[PDB]
Amino acid sequence: LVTGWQTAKPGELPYIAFSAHVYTSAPDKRSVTLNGERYREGDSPYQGLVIEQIEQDMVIFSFNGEPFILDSLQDWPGGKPGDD
C-alpha cells in the first residue's frame, strides 16, 4: 500500500506506512518496515528523521531534534509531529 517517501512541506513528514517491526534482545538485529523498506537503529529513512531506538512496543525517532514516537505498526498520517 505505500512505498517510498512522498514529498513533504519543510519540517513535515510524509505518510509513513509502518507495516512490520522485529524486536530482539540483540539491538543490531531489530528492524522496522517503513514505507516498504526495512530499517535499523541509526538509519535515517528521510531527512533528518533518524531511528534512535527500536523498542518492543514502539520506535523512538528524532525528527529535527525533537523526539517522535510511533507505536508498533502505528502509521503517521503525514504532517509536523507537532500539531495534529
XYZ file of C-alpha atoms in Angstrom:
84
model
C 0.000 0.000 0.000
C 2.752 2.917 0.451
C 6.286 2.568 -0.988
C 8.940 5.302 -0.635
C 8.570 8.784 0.730
C 6.099 11.314 -0.617
C 7.195 14.925 -0.849
C 6.507 16.949 2.308
C 6.454 20.586 3.417
C 9.615 21.785 5.184
C 9.509 20.492 8.806
C 6.831 17.907 7.989
C 6.893 14.150 7.458
C 5.034 12.458 4.659
C 2.714 9.490 5.212
C 4.572 6.630 6.962
C 3.169 3.169 6.499
C 4.630 1.247 9.483
C 3.932 -2.248 8.325
C 6.325 -4.532 10.254
C 8.526 -4.499 13.392
C 11.126 -7.008 14.678
C 12.434 -6.905 18.267
C 15.314 -8.955 19.622
C 17.399 -8.508 22.716
C 20.300 -8.085 20.234
C 19.934 -4.363 19.247
C 21.582 -4.595 15.794
C 19.045 -7.363 14.882
C 15.981 -5.113 15.408
C 14.151 -3.697 12.413
C 11.140 -1.790 11.296
C 9.494 -1.640 7.897
C 8.558 1.914 6.948
C 7.093 2.683 3.580
C 8.108 -0.743 2.155
C 11.776 -0.580 3.220
C 13.399 -2.257 6.203
C 15.469 -0.014 8.528
C 17.725 -0.388 11.597
C 18.619 1.605 14.668
C 20.676 4.500 13.446
C 19.238 4.761 9.932
C 17.690 7.918 8.671
C 14.743 6.938 6.371
C 14.003 10.529 5.379
C 15.875 13.782 6.171
C 16.581 14.286 9.163
C 14.363 11.648 10.624
C 16.601 9.236 12.477
C 15.637 5.934 14.018
C 17.044 6.352 17.543
C 15.819 3.092 19.192
C 13.556 0.184 18.283
C 11.722 -0.984 21.446
C 9.370 -3.905 21.842
C 6.133 -1.877 21.547
C 7.322 1.300 19.731
C 10.058 3.044 17.814
C 11.680 6.224 19.013
C 12.736 8.624 16.275
C 14.264 12.018 16.419
C 12.900 14.480 13.894
C 14.719 17.803 13.544
C 15.983 17.310 17.107
C 12.690 16.600 18.857
C 11.649 13.069 19.813
C 8.913 11.482 17.739
C 7.342 8.160 18.614
C 5.210 5.661 16.780
C 3.805 2.645 18.484
C 4.455 -0.650 16.783
C 2.529 -0.668 13.437
C 1.177 2.858 14.076
C 1.256 4.826 10.795
C 1.990 8.505 10.596
C -0.741 10.227 8.540
C 1.696 12.978 7.490
C 2.395 16.461 8.858
C 4.560 18.062 11.508
C 4.878 15.919 14.549
C 3.610 18.899 16.420
C 0.023 19.847 15.897
C -2.456 17.165 14.964
